[PDB]
């Protein structure tokens, strides 16, 4: 599908509300496998199961290993911009 830019708002006491799978060591993108109900990703409205996360806050995630992506993603705070695509 089309590449989308999506804004997510979260407070410091919560996580993103996403489960991710995949990663470069597996030859696949960082993929959203769950959106946890009522948490920031669900509330933001524009992120969905099956989305590949291509970048976050200008940080490219297309060739990142799983744990690299976890560190990068969990570091982001407040108003967070995602670039995503559903295939």
């Amino acid at each position: 599908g089309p590449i989308r830019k999506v804004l997510l708002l979260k407070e410091d006491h919560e996580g993103l509300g996403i489960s991710i799978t995949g990663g470069k060591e597996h030859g696949v993108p960082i993929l959203i496998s769950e959106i946890h109900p009522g948490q920031p990703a669900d509330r933001c409205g524009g992120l969905h199961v099956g989305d590949a996360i291509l970048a976050v806050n200008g940080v490219n995630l297309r060739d990142t290993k799983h744990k690299e992506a976890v560190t990068i993603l969990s570091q982001q705070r407040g108003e967070i911009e995602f670039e995503v695509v559903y295939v």
């Binding site: 996580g15 993103l16 996403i18 489960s19 991710i20 799978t21 995949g22 990663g23 597996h26 696949v28 496998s33 769950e34 946890h36 799983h66 744990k67 976890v70 993603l73 969990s74």
Partner: peptide
């Protein structure tokens, strides 16, 4: 593949 909640 591994899965992490974040």
């Amino acid at each position: 593949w591994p899965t992490s909640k974040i």
